[PDB]
Design a protein around this ligand. Structure first.
Ligand code: 9PH
Ligand SMILES: OC[C@H]1O[C@@H](O[C@@H]2[C@@H](O)[C@H](O[C@@H]3[C@@H](O)[C@H](O)O[C@H](CO)[C@H]3O)O[C@H](CO)[C@H]2O)[C@H](O)[C@@H](O)[C@@H]1O
Length: 434
């Protein structure tokens, strides 16, 4: 049963409970365990392990949260036990689609079949749960003025995740984005993710401006609130909780759910539940795997308990595309033109028909540098500044390298692929006459 968590929907720039019609405010906390050859995932999935999640939900109940942010799940595992247990306490989940080893690389951005398959796998694993609030299609991909050209790839991912969900039988769970708070890029990022024909469904900011006993005016919260007034999609703090002054008083919570900010922001999520040698936890898991409550816990609890955001209703709220930021060198370099939807069938054709292949199972930079001096690699390049995306730039890195290696076609016709490496092999399927 999911009776205590009706699905949340979006109308305009606010979240609403689909049954009651009351505005939904996120009162959240991040919930994600870390690890301190390859028979286990690098990330830990607490929502796939009942002994972990059922230990912590009682403490999450005491905190008074209605939402968790989860950064990584293992889509091959079941999550029904933990998601139902969360639902029984009225708790929702915001979930990143990416994971540390399968994300849009801000240093070399691509939007390809490998990353898209990850996103699809998470969507298909988690979309049956009414308490899945929303998906993040990226987290702080562009994070300063040197990598703004990564953002078109994130917008493509938003578009394609939304389209995949639309064409599925699933509930149309919204897909948004989580950004950082770099002064020189933040305004352009916010506009970019609602500009043109593709829009984020909601916008999370990882917000650490309020440290210690600050105020609405002095923290920067007032200027942020004025900046986001009239923003066309729901906006909230996807992280908060500056730890400069400890124990964290969390007095930002009073501002966030007060009358000035509650008309603009849809709440936020504290970072985070677990203490991981970083002074950001509200609990520490001891050597006996038990929960030890830390000094921050009582302050966050008291602040969430006192918070009482005066929202509006769905019916009372109900009673011209925005221009993308212009390009300026060294400032904003995200083209409005987005890469195409990654095509698994076209890229799977390369696995079938190419004479020379390379298995995945340092070498990429060396072999791309080598091969792209011998053949034209334009067809696998993707440029988010200029909006030029090669025909096969949506294929996996190994497919891309295999294409260039095959482009063999020297013309010896002797099944000897022109690259010395154990991962290189001649594909016998290429001989069989998409
Ligand atoms: O796309 C982009 C990239 O994404 C990286 O992967 C990120 C990965 O870096 C990110 O890590 C977050 C991480 O960003 C987040 N976090 C929060 C904090 C608190 O920050 C305090 C702080 C705040 C401001 C200033 C100083 C300090 N520190 N880390 O913590 C959670 C849980 O502990 C981590 O899962 O999680 C995302 C979702 O799983 C991944 O997509 C990739 O590794 C990579 O190649 C790819 O360029
Ligand atoms: O500079 C790049 C960096 O920006 C970070 O966001 C900053 C905030 O960290 C900063 O917060 C200040 C507090 O640290 C300080 O104690 O109080 C003052 C107000 O009295 C705060 O301004 O504020 C600036 C301007 O709003 C933000 O840009 C990002 O979190 C980080 O991702 C980025 O690398």
């Amino acid at each position: 049963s999911f009776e205590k968590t009706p699905a949340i929907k979006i109308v305009g720039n606010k979240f609403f409970d689909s049954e009651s019609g009351e505005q939904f405010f996120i009162k959240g906390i991040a919930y994600q365990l870390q690890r301190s050859g390859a028979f286990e995932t690098s990330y830990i999935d607490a929502l796939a392990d009942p002994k972990i999640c059922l230990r912590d939900i009682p403490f999450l109940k005491m905190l008074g949260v209605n939402t968790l942010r989860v950064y990584a799940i293992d889509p091959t595992k079941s999550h029904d036990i933990c998601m139902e247990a969360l639902s029984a306490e009225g708790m929702y989940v915001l979930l990143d689609l990416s994971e540390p080893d399968i994300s849009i690389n801000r240093e070399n951005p691509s939007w390809d079949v490998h990353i898209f398959e990850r996103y699809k796998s998470v969507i298909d694993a988690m979309s049956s749960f009414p308490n899945l609030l929303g998906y993040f299609a990226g987290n702080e991909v562009t994070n300063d003025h040197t990598n703004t050209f990564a953002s078109p790839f994130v917008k493509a991912a938003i578009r394609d995740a939304k389209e995949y969900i639309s064409h599925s039988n699933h509930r149309k769970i919204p897909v948004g984005y989580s950004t950082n708070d770099d002064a020189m890029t933040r305004d352009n990022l916010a506009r970019y993710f609602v500009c043109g024909d593709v829009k984020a469904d909601f916008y999370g900011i990882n917000m650490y401006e309020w440290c210690g006993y600050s105020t609405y005016g002095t923290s920067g919260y007032r200027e942020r609130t004025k900046e986001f007034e009239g923003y066309p999609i729901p906006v909230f703090f996807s992280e908060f909780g500056c730890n400069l002054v400890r124990p964290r008083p969390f007095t930002e919570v009073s501002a966030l759910y007060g009358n000035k900010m509650s008309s603009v922001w849809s709440g936020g999520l504290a970072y985070m539940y677990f203490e991981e040698e970083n002074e950001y936890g509200v609990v520490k898991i001891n050597d006996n795997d038990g929960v030890d409550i830390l000094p921050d816990f009582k302050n966050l609890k008291k602040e969430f308990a006192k918070a009482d955001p005066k929202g509006i209703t769905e019916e009372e709220y109900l009673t011209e595309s925005v221009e993308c930021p212009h390009i300026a060198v060294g400032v904003w370099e995200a083209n409005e033109k987005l890469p195409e939807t990654p095509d698994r069938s076209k890229c799977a054709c390369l696995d079938e028909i190419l004479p020379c292949e390379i298995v995945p199972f340092g070498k990429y930079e060396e072999y791309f540098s080598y091969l792209c001096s011998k053949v034209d690699c334009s067809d696998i390049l993707a440029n988010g500044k200029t909006g030029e995306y090669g025909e096969f730039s949506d294929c996996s890195v190994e497919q891309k390298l295999s294409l260039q290696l095959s482009k063999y076609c020297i013309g010896a016709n002797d099944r000897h692929c022109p690259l010395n490496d154990k991962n290189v092999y001649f594909n016998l399927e290429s001989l069989q006459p998409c």
